[PDB]
Design an enzyme around this catalytic site. Sequence first.
Site, PDB file in Angstrom:
ATOM      1  N   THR A  37       0.880  -1.200   0.000  1.00 24.91           N
ATOM      2  CA  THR A  37       0.000   0.000   0.000  1.00 24.91           C
ATOM      3  C   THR A  37       0.898   1.225   0.000  1.00 24.91           C
ATOM      4  O   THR A  37       2.000   1.150   0.541  1.00 24.91           O
ATOM      5  CB  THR A  37      -0.866   0.004   1.295  1.00 24.91           C
ATOM      6  OG1 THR A  37      -1.969  -0.891   1.143  1.00 24.91           O
ATOM      7  CG2 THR A  37      -1.561   1.376   1.531  1.00 24.91           C
ATOM      8  N   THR A  38       0.442   2.318  -0.627  1.00 20.90           N
ATOM      9  CA  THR A  38       1.068   3.638  -0.521  1.00 20.90           C
ATOM     10  C   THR A  38       0.001   4.704  -0.279  1.00 20.90           C
ATOM     11  O   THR A  38      -0.956   4.799  -1.045  1.00 20.90           O
ATOM     12  CB  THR A  38       1.820   4.009  -1.804  1.00 20.90           C
ATOM     13  OG1 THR A  38       2.717   2.968  -2.131  1.00 20.90           O
ATOM     14  CG2 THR A  38       2.735   5.208  -1.570  1.00 20.90           C
TER      15      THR A  38
END
Lengths: 203, 203, 203, 203, 203, 203, 203, 203, 203, 203
Positions: free
Chosen positions: C1-2
């Site tokens: 995830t970012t």
Amino acid sequence: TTTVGITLKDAVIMATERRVTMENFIMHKNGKKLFQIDTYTGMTIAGLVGDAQVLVRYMKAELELYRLQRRVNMPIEAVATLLSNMLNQVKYMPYMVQLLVGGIDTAPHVFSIDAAGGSVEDIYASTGSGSPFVYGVLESQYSEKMTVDEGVDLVIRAISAAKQRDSASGGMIDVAVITRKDGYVQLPTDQIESRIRKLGLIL
Amino acid sequence: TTTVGITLKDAVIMATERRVTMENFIMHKNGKKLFQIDTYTGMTIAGLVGDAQVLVRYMKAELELYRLQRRVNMPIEAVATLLSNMLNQVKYMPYMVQLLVGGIDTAPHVFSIDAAGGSVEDIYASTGSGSPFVYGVLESQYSEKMTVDEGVDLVIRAISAAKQRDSASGGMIDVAVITRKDGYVQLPTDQIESRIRKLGLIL
Amino acid sequence: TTTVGITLKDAVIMATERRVTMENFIMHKNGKKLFQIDTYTGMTIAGLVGDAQVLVRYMKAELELYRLQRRVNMPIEAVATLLSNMLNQVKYMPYMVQLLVGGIDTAPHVFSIDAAGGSVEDIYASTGSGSPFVYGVLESQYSEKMTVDEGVDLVIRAISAAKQRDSASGGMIDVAVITRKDGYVQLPTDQIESRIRKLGLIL
Amino acid sequence: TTTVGITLKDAVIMATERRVTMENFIMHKNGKKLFQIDTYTGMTIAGLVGDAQVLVRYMKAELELYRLQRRVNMPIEAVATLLSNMLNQVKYMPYMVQLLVGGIDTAPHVFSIDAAGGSVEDIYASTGSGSPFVYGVLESQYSEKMTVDEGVDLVIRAISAAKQRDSASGGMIDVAVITRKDGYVQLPTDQIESRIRKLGLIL
Amino acid sequence: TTTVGITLKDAVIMATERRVTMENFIMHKNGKKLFQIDTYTGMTIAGLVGDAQVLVRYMKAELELYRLQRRVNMPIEAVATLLSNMLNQVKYMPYMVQLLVGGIDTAPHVFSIDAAGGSVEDIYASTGSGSPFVYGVLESQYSEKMTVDEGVDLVIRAISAAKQRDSASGGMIDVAVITRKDGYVQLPTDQIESRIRKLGLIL
Amino acid sequence: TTTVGITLKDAVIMATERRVTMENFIMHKNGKKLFQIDTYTGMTIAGLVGDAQVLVRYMKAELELYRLQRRVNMPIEAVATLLSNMLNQVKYMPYMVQLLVGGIDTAPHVFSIDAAGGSVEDIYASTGSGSPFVYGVLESQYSEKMTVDEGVDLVIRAISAAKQRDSASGGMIDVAVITRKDGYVQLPTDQIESRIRKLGLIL
Amino acid sequence: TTTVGITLKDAVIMATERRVTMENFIMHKNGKKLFQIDTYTGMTIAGLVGDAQVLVRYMKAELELYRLQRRVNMPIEAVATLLSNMLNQVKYMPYMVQLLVGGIDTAPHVFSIDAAGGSVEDIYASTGSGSPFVYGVLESQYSEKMTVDEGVDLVIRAISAAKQRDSASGGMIDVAVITRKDGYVQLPTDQIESRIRKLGLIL
Amino acid sequence: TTTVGITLKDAVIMATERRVTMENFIMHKNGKKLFQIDTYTGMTIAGLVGDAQVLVRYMKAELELYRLQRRVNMPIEAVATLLSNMLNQVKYMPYMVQLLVGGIDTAPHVFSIDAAGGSVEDIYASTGSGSPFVYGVLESQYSEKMTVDEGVDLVIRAISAAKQRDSASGGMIDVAVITRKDGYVQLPTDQIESRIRKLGLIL
Amino acid sequence: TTTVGITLKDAVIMATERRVTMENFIMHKNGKKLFQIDTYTGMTIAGLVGDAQVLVRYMKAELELYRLQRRVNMPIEAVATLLSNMLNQVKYMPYMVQLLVGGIDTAPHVFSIDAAGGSVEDIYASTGSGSPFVYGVLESQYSEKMTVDEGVDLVIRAISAAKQRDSASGGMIDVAVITRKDGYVQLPTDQIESRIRKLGLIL
Amino acid sequence: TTTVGITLKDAVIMATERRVTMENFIMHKNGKKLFQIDTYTGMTIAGLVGDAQVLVRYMKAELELYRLQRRVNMPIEAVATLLSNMLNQVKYMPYMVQLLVGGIDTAPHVFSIDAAGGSVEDIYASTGSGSPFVYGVLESQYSEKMTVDEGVDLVIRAISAAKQRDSASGGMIDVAVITRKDGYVQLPTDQIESRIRKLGLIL
């Protein structure tokens, strides 16, 4: 990683992608996992990169030596047997790899070799984390009657499907075709990119 | 630690910082992590210091010997292959390192070698705890079309970004440029300080 | 995830990607990770999906209730304090998450909250496996003087860089801009695609 | 186990196989894994059979109760949200299951819910040990523009491919189609057997 | 895996299936597990594939050498004794296998050999994960008075029952009949398929 | 232990042996593992004896209560559902058992229930350490068209085969036949002994 | 396993059963556990079958070699001492066995040898899982004054009792009588069967 | 410890020895392990002394209370069922005991109850470390047709054998006989000594 | 086990019992634990039987060889020193024993040697599980002024006490007396029995 | 610690030493381990000092309360039963102690109670690390016919022997004599010292 080898009437097609990760970290987008190891013989690698690369070097050397000594190429089943002996001999301190060996002697062959030297011939096979997605595509779409051109399209579709669902797979698809006429031939990238477009796919 | 190597048309640029830690303890602010190992060949080191230092001495010795024996420099891929064999051979009692090897033979090359001897060629690469921050900068800003002066500024920006976010990175940035025309040149500290100023950075 | 959140003079910009994995298995290409939780308040989620989703529902509910009870929106620092108390209270049976809370009260704010309820305000912040790559981009390129349009391009560049290097990140980039004048606005996908094109990026 | 849910313009199609194993031991060839849980809602189960069966009973009861209390069917996203809450609440003593929830309210929906209550909507999804093989087939073959008949053949092909490669999958394929016009319709066994024959498949 | 060896008045019948799995993953549908190792001697393999294949190669080679040296075939009990010595010698670093050796010298013999070199002669035996299901069929149906045709039907029924209940077993049944008169004869696939039809069986 | 339940046209047949072991130690030769728990319902027990015996008492009591309250017998699927709920409720502190419940309501049914409350209906089933040997015999010899007399012989054959190969099984075979017409009938020992003679068996 | 050795005035009697198990799985009903190792010397084996079989072969070979070298039979106490030395020398990588050695030199002897080479002479002894049951019978019924016929009945009674209570023991009882007059004599199976009938026992 | 209970036509005989150890340390030579718990009911104890003593007190109290409440003695099977419930209720925090309960209601009964509450009726049973030696004697010598005097000699023979071979057993033998005519009668020490003398035994 | 050695003016007395156990199982009632190893030297053994027996053989051989080489017996302290060296040399792979060595050279000596080769001379010593009970008796009753007859009664009293309280000790007491005048003399069993009788003891 | 209790015709004698250690550290030379707990009742303590001291306080309180409530002293067997109940009730969170309770009701009694509440009456008993040495002395020298003066000498001899050989025992010996005539009488230290001198002992 995703690699695949398929047999067709008088041909073998092998293919991989190129992503090299450490956990989630994509260190290299353009690793090489498909190698010519003899005139009509190719190998793909999955698993610990250092181990696999040593094996590729050893196979390139041994198959060249053998060819010079015997005045004929090592039979593909002999390549698989050699690898089987080598890997089994160190099973308790192993090469942490999964290998495909593909090639043509009197007949096309693909063998799948595990880290304990277990070797099994198949009409097609796939290795690496992306292999189950490939097996789905091949179960549904492979035909023993396909032309080389159709087989190339098939492996491109299979590896593209794996890249969509396996985060450890990615990058440009590399493809080699092995025939008695031309030996092992790595397809030009432009051609693979062209097929990806005309198949309506990604990357 | 942060090290980086990039290729440009006819150039390789390699850079590191200099911080040496024992966990959180900054023992040395000015360790050396970038070395000329041949006429047109450089290496950076990350990981266990004693292991990396032994390999630098081994590489300097062996490439000098090879040069005298062959009357030409070891090709950069051959450098990476030798290290690959050496590191894989002791994989169960390993050199706990990450290495970049960079240089010019008929073309520029950067290779990244891991502790099991896996070696991958890339257009650019980064190692050490600081590498993720470098890869952000390079992904955003690298262009294959850059001049040497632009590439030098790039590696300075990348390593300065890593210094801001990796507590195991720090100290003066060391940079070398490798070309066929000028050989291996370590840029003077005054030049790097000047660029740090003109880029609006610190240290 | 970012995920990322930045402050500018009178604006907050928050952005994420959308990839949801089970180890290497990409289950969902279009998960939602950015949520409006109040009139001028947004939150991003990283970590265990079920935990993060429960907290989004809890925050939407509680900030709505608080708003009706107090007749004003919960101050952004109060949002972060509430979450801080909630997460610390179950620290030994925790919500396994990283949260960004961003919004405008009398001024723009971004807070980053961890699984033990530690909360820190920052000018910008990033969470998830992709965050190191984002921090490289932001360290190199963020300026407090940026316009909203420049800040939107920045977060797109940062997340696109993370997508290139973090296999747990992927899919369409979602962006929201929060101002007193226009409230919380999620930018249309067509606008983000347009900027991705004009910046020379992919997807 | 293999289960799949796909959405098309105005329909949802869900399908499973029937094998129940204890390690390698095929205990039952005809377990039931696809259930109607509301007028226009279905659910598939994977994972621990006891846990899954308790949840099926709970959902049947609660959706019936909800419908009687509200005078309308629970929205599909509400069903998924309810399950998310229930499963996350007991995250540390969990229902060791994977769930698909599919149905029609104002539009078709498929949600995938994990043992920590992470719930994500998707255009298609698959669960169980056979799912990666299904994902290969769907990546390659799914189209949003498919008719119901085509979508039914697709799920049959996908589950058939899974049965060929996943020893924990087997038995007769069960299929349900959900529409506004016709409600939840479980397809007759002789209709699925007909399609298996016509598509050139087995079991 | 399922293998079986039975003795009758003047014959030995040995049979296997062909499935090779990695956990639940069916990698190969057509592995070979039954081998002729001498003129009137057969072997089946179960357990770790790489170890078993090494032993088959070792046995083919040694029995051939012994035959040329002694001018007679190695006695069946001597084959079992040789294997017993070899496997016990490495019992702390073992070949992780279960073997059946069957053949005719002055009489029919079936021996079962374990990974510590324990070797026991029996009237019939079965190895692999499917063996308990085979032992049920044999206990109920085996007769010392059976004809070869009746024995071939029995082994087919037994392995067919194992394939129905053991997910690690599957694929085509291989059968060999060994007699003084005809030697070692692997039955044609067509003949086995025909028996499967007449017996009213599946997979 | 070995237990079995089979369904026929209008009958259920259930059977067990009687051996109680502590490791290799045969403590009791004549334990009871087959119980009538309602007018047309039987249950067999395998696993931890104290747990199984508590459940037998709980089931006899509850089915009697329910019958008095409802003025009808609990439907067989309701018995299994009740057990499913009970066992799952305590899954992390479980009854360490495998249960078969068989009986007649509007039709014959056999259900197999595991220690997490997973319950599945089958045409036949078997539990205990001797169950794989039973499954062999059933796969090979069961027919849905068998008479009660034929079904009784079948279960005797199946259990006898198990006793020959499972050292944790032994002693007299107990058999019950359940029909609408005659109710639950435990067959007398002399009748089973007579059948054992006529079938040519042991013990 | 159950084995026994007793001494009488001018005789040694040794006896075993024949069951070979893996856990509860009765793999072989007719293993051999009693062996002639010299003219007037016998040995029984218990424990790991591969280890014990190697030792049987070693003892047969060495006692024959010794007899040829010395022109007399190895004294029974010397046989036990040789075994004691051999087993102790590898005590940290042991033969996992229990052995009885019995025979006549100038007098009858029974010795019991453990896996560390501890060797003790006794008037009678028993090994294997069934041995405690045997010791019960011998404590109650052994008399030093017994005739050979009485001793044979005693060991048959002892092993029969062990077979009733030890599920790891079973099969036909094997008995050998050793005298100076008649040497090592293995009793015919018909004779033992006749004694079992006459004593009113089973199997 | 050694305890035994046997049934004869109209009698139960129960017996124990008296040795109490702490590993090899004989703390007490004269513990009590056989108790009258009702008018026609006895119990023996083996296992953790403190646990067993609590249960002796609990059973004496409850059986007295029940007798006063019901005006009849608790049936022997009820006694075993009560214990079964009690022990199983605390199976995860157990009474670490083995119990025999023996007595006369309308018939003689002996039940053996384990630490998880598993309870099985038998014609005879034995508990404690000395039990296997007892079982050998009973298997060889028990007859259902025995008189009380014969049965008393048998149990004395059985415990005496156990005392010779189980170092955890020892001391004087205690014996009780239970009949309808005479009730529970603990035999006087001098009568047991006289029988030990006449039978030709020790202690 | 219990062994003891005492010194008196011109004599050494050594004694043991004979019980050999495997945990609680009395395997042998008549082991030998006291050995003459030289003209005026004895040794007792406690601990791992196989280890101790090897050392008995080693010491008998070496002391004979030394006596022949030196024409004098090895001094008792030399015997203890030789053992000390031998045992310590293998301390990480040890002989798991306790040894007493006693004898007469110019004076009486008793040495106690442990499994790491620690050797200490004492006026008396005891080894084995029964030793603490022996030490109580000796502390209370030993006098340096005792006659040989008194010292013999003392050791019999001490071992008899140990046999009453140590379940790992038992059987007949063996006693040897060593003097210059008479050499090593093992007392006849009937003399020890007569002393047991007269002292008022058991066994 | 060493404690002892013996019974004589109309008396109980109890005795301890006084050393308190932590490992090898002698912290206290004069701890108290012998306590009057009722008019004619004493208790000794061994094990964890804090646990034992709590129990001494509890027993003093409860026996006083009981005497006031019942108008008679608690019977000694009742004291042991109360202790047995209390200790067993917390067996999983135990008082880590060994206790002796001695006294006179209608007769002298000594009971030994362990940490799980196991309680056994004996004519004499000893607890603590020094107890085996005590048992040696008592086995050799105890006589039921001893006078009180003789018994006092015996316990002094026994504990003195224990102090010589158990480094966890030491200090002054404390002795109490319990009679109906004189009650609980702790012997004056000068009297014990005088006996130690007269018996020719130490400390």
